[PDB]
């Protein structure tokens, strides 16, 4: 099985570790971990095209969107649209997602790209909505790396 | 991908940006950039197997060597100011295939390529 990991870091309190696992190339990717330092409530969660962090999250580039589609929800979407995570009253968000569109191999591979958590909720393109989901600024991010 | 980039950072003052470009599949990879905050002289320059920086550079795993070893990028050289300018061509590493270094960790060592501790590291990301 292929595994990956990402350390999310920002310019404030926001930080997290997110794990990825995919049993088969054609199968779903399991995404799990936690993010702290967040405002209570919903936060956009997505993969950007580039794993360029030379300017923090500002350099992560466009949304990961190989098929040139409109922004949407994970169940609708760009390959990078992973929906929302929810933070509790202590600012801690549990991440537990199973997604069949991202991958750890092939054209939808996200290894080497940037994972980002956003300031606001991603409207899933149901609101700029069909672009960035109106999720606001990038709070923290990291490059997705190969793991064991 | 035809280009990759890595931001090196550590617990100390060592920091750098390293670029990788491979315009042709399976072709040579150009490696260039600058690393500062080092002691004057030679420092081991390597790619580690895993892009896992959950425990800083200590979680990056063994040097990349599927099965010189692929990850062994020799040395960079810091001047008296502590700056190491990098410009290398490497035909062993790659941005695809069995020798792909995307998603793995780049590291700079305390001493020459016995290399001592990992002063700084970062995950190699897709740049273009």
Curated annotation (Swiss-Prot), chain A:
Q: What class of enzyme is it?
A: oxidoreductase
| Modification after translation, per record | The ditryptophan cross-link at Trp-32 is responsible for the non-disulfide-linked homodimerization. Such modification might only occur in extreme conditions and additional experimental evidence is required. Palmitoylation helps nuclear targeting and decreases catalytic activity.
Q: Which residues carry this modification: N6-acetyllysine?
A: 120, 131
EC number, UniProt record:
1.15.1.1
Describe what happens upon changing residue 45 to C.
In ALS1; slow progression
User: Impact of changing residue 129 to N on the protein?
Assistant: In ALS1; reduced metal binding; increases tendency to form fibrillar aggregates
Q: What is the effect of changing residue 141 to S?
A: Enhances formation of fibrillar aggregates in the absence of bound zinc
Q: Where does Cu cation bind?
A: 46, 48, 63, 118
Q: Look up what happens after changing residue 128 to Q.
A: Abolishes dimerization
As for what it does, the entry says: Destroys radicals which are normally produced within the cells and which are toxic to biological systems.
Could you tell me what this protein is called? Superoxide dismutase [Cu-Zn]
Source organism of the structure: Homo sapiens (Human)
From Swiss-Prot, chain B:
Variant or mutagenesis effect after changing residue 45 to C: In ALS1; slow progression
Q: Which residues carry this modification: N6-succinyllysine?
A: 3, 9, 80, 111
| GO BP, one annotated term | regulation of GTPase activity
Q: Provide the protein's localization.
A: Cytoplasm; Nucleus
Q: Which Pfam families match?
A: Sod_Cu
Cofactors demanded by this protein: Cu cation; Zn(2+)
Q: Where are the transmembrane segments?
A: none
A GO term for molecular function: protein-folding chaperone binding
What is the name attached to this protein's record?
A: Superoxide dismutase [Cu-Zn]
Instruction: From the UniProt record, report the name of the gene that encodes this protein.
Output: SOD1
